[PDB]
Structure 1
């Protein structure tokens, strides 16, 4: 028997679905999402890391001008400085006083640190949804791990589960993301081969091991101080280091819908967005024939206490006369009231307790305790605690879910005004009918 139901994508909140298969005693399955993962498909664009500026020892010609040679190195710069008379610890380096010329050169290489310290620039396309579902089946807890794209069937205890597709394609990840050691950011990183100095992606490579490096640090060689050999330069500070200080909050801190973000692989977990359809194929052996089930008659529901405290604060006691010893599934007939127990045991003339959660001011609801139904009603009190550390187990209320006392007042007021109108309307109708009787 194939049963199709839909639950909210909210994680950690159990939902109950009634499987009503004619000829068999009603079955109730409790399903809870333990984990929902949206794993984006990524394509690496480039690696950003700290750059190393390489400055080979300067070449000094005591007499005669040095010549520059072009090189293909990532950001090669070379300049000749005439009129230089450098000193070493033991005295002037050159015999020549004025004809001395220095050749300075420098280039940029990706640092050895880039092997472990780097940010990866990725493009995200679509997400592969995956979910772990806890199901109470035949009274046992079975965990179903399946892809939530609607195309993965998982069979446990001969029950086949289809999960998804997701009702929402929403993902916390943007088209372009940057990943740094567990921290994922949504940013429009600059195009490969066209990065800018002092900004993220100033030095770029396609892979951490690639020797193909783009660099735009605008390295400029300056004239050495008189009497010295050092090679001064002006260069934009690594955009990677600046980014690390200016990263801002990561997606696990900024994402909507309470999404948890993790890396290796990049994952968005437990995003409370949309619904997740579930289809369960339940084998005939799993069902108990109606005639083989206890029949419950002479039922009466009493509700000794009710508080709409979001944690099954309500308790109801149901008296019953069971035809025989056995088990019966319990289901609420209204969405407004959720019952914690999926099944109870029945025997003879006795009573059972059920814990329930509702937002209702007045808990008017019906309960199916096996094959028969009983009507429950109560006045529910508010909680004293303003804040809790858990999501409500009950659903929200509509405008029609006001209290019984409030409804009585509304009916009396509405009826009072409606009666005045109905009477005034009748008087006018009679007068008009008379007015047309005098034509």
Structure 2
């Protein structure tokens, strides 16, 4: 038997329904989202870290011209200075008076500690939601994982559940994502080969051990002022360090719908944002015939101290005079009130107590025991506790959040105004007919 329903995306908060075939006893269907994740498809643009500036040993040629060629090194900057007179410990360094030339080199590479402190730039595509479902049908429990895409069946051969497309697409990650040490940021890094000095991604490579490193740090070589053999140079600050200084807060703290960002792979787990259509092909072995289940001769429902809140606030008692002892499901036929218990054991005569959670100020709903309705009818009070540590199990909706003796006043005033309209109209017609 195939049953289609719609569950909330909130992790935890089990969803209850009952399945009623024409010739079979109803059974409880119990759909719980125990876990979820929203993993986008990522491709790595580059890696980056704080660069290490390598200044090689200077070249000195004693009154003979020097020039330097192009190099494949990362941000290779070169300059030649003529008319030098270098000195080291020991004395002068060339045999020639004032035509001596010095060639100064400079480039960058990865720091030795980039194996730990480094950032990875990613472009992420549309994310797919995969949920872990606990399905209790009758009294059989199955745990599975399914993709929320509309056509892929769940990971269960004996149940064949299909999760329909998600109500809305959330995708907490922006198009460009930076990951550093498990911290995830929505940063718009520059493209590969488009380095900017003093900003993030000033040095880039395909991997940490890659040899094709490219960088555009603002390095420049100065003419040596004193006559030692140092290489004077000025460079822009490390754009990786500059980004670390003002990275802001990661997406683990700034992400809607209260779901936590995890790496390896990049994903957002336990997001509560939409509604998932779920279709279950319940096997016929789970069903039982209507004659097998105990029957209800009469049943009455009395609600005692209904308190509308997020937890299971409110209790009701079903008094029944059933036939033969047996277990049968119970349900609340309302979208504004959900029971706590699913199946109960009934005897020849007695009363059973159930706990329910509602978002409406009145307990005005139909409770079915063994498939037999009971139409519970009472009032509920606003809660005393302002703040609770669990989410609401029932969505709040109009026409139920407004109670009677508040609907009564509105209907009375509207009916009075309409009564004045009708009496004015009929007196006008009576005057016109004369």
Normalised by the shorter chain, which TM-score bucket? Answer: over 0.9
Residue 321 of structure 2: aligned partner: 321
Q: Cα distance 1:395–1:374, how it changes in 2: closer, same or farther (>3 A)?
A: same
Aligned to 2:107: 107
- Shift of residue 153 of structure 1? 2.7
Match of 2:200 in 1: 200
CA RMSD of aligned residues (A): 2.0
Name 1:437's counterpart in structure 2: none
SS at match of 2:134: strand
Cα distance in 2, alignment partners of residues 384 and 200 from structure 1:
52
Distance in 1 separating the partners of 2:226 and 2:140? 86
Residue by residue over 1:372-399, the C-alpha shift from the partner in whole angstroms, topping out at 9 and shown as x without a partner, is: 1001111211111111121111221213
1:332-351 Cα offsets, whole Å, 9 max, x none, are: 11111111111111001101
* Correspondence for 1:361: 361
Structure 1 residues 299 and 233, CA gap change in structure 2 (3 angstroms): same
Match of 2:381 in 1: 381
Task: Summarize the alignment of residues 62-77 of structure 1 with structure 2, pairs less than 5 Å apart.
Answer: 62-77=62-77
Pick which of 348-357 and 41-50 moved more: 41-50
1:92 is displaced (CA, Å) by 4.2
| Deviant stretches of 4+, over 6 Å | none
Alignment-derived partner of residue 409 in structure 2: 409
In 1, are the aligned partners of 2:147 and 2:154 still within 8 Å (CA)? Answer: no
Q: Distance in 2 between matches of 1:217 and 1:157?
A: 58
Query: How far apart, in 2, do the equivalents of 1:274 and 1:171 lie?
Result: 12
Indicate the SS of the match to 1:145.
strand
Tell me whether 1:352 sits opposite 2:352 in the alignment: yes
Aligned equivalents of 1:69 and 1:328: distance in 2?
88
Distance in 2 of aligned mates of 1:314 and 1:329: 19
**SS class of match (1:392):** coil
TM-superposed deviation, 1:63: 4.3
TM-score by length of 1: 0.93
Q: Which residue pairs with 2:391 in the alignment?
A: 391
Q: Is the 8 A contact 2:330 2:371 kept in 1?
A: no
For residue 281 of structure 1, what is the aligned residue in structure 2? 281
Q: Which residue of 2 aligns with 1:337?
A: 337
Query: In the TM superposition, what are the counterparts of 1:150-229 in structure 2 within 5 Å?
Result: 150-154=150-154, 156=156, 158-229=158-229
Superposed CA offset, 1:337-372 (max 9, x none): 111111111001101111111121121111111121
Distance 2:314 2:85 in 1: 93
Aligned-pair CA distance for 1:155:
6.0
Which aligned pairs between 1:121-140 and structure 2 lie closer than 5 A?
121-140=121-140
Matched residue count? 434
Change (3 A) 1:197 1:138: same
Determine if contact 2:202/2:215 at 8 Å carries over to the other structure. Answer: yes
CA distance in 2, matches of 1:369, 1:221: 87
2-structure distance, mates of 1:24, 1:155: 27
- Determine helix, strand or coil for the equivalent of 1:284: coil
Tell me, in whole angstroms, the C-alpha distance in 1 between the residues paired with 2:388 and 2:213: 54
Mapped partners of 2:148, 2:400: distance in 1: 35
Does residue 371 of structure 2 align to residue 371 of structure 1? yes
Task: Report if the CA contact (8 A) 1:172-1:259 is conserved.
Answer: no
Distance 1:164 1:180 in 2: 35
Are 2:106 and 1:119 equivalent residues in the alignment? no
- Tell me how far apart the structure 1 counterparts of residues 155 and 101 of structure 2 sit (CA, whole Å): 81
Q: CA deviation at 1:188?
A: 2.3
Partner of 2:30: 30
CA shift for structure 1 position 424: 2.3
Contact 1:85 1:226 in 2 (8 A): no
Measured against aligned partners, the alpha-carbon deviations of 1:82-107 in whole angstroms (never above 9, x if no partner) come to: 34334434444445553443221112
Shift of residue 69 of structure 1? 3.6
Q: Which runs of 5+ in 2 are unaligned?
A: none
Deviates more, 1:341-350 or 1:135-144: 135-144
TM-aligned CA distance change 1:80 to 1:269, over 3 Å: same
State the SS of the aligned residue for 2:363: coil
Relative to structure 1, the CA distance from residue 399 to residue 322 in structure 2 (aligned partners, 3 Å threshold; closer, same or farther) is closer
Per-residue deviation at 1:203? 0.9
- Contact 2:359/2:394, CA 8 A, preserved across alignment: yes
2:27, 2:137 within 8 Å by CA — same for their partners in 1?
A: no
Aligned partner of residue 379 in structure 1, secondary structure: strand
Aligned-residue offset at 1:318: 0.8
Task: Provide TM-score, normalisation by structure 2.
Answer: 0.94
TM-superposed CA distance for 1:156, in Å, is 4.8
Q: 1:287 and 1:278 mapped to 2: Cα distance?
A: 19
The answer to whether the Cα contact below 8 Å between 1:337 and 1:365 also exists between their aligned partners in 2 is: yes
Quick one: structure 1 residues 417 and 67, their matched pair in 2 at CA, closer, same or farther if it must change by over 3 Å?
Answer: closer
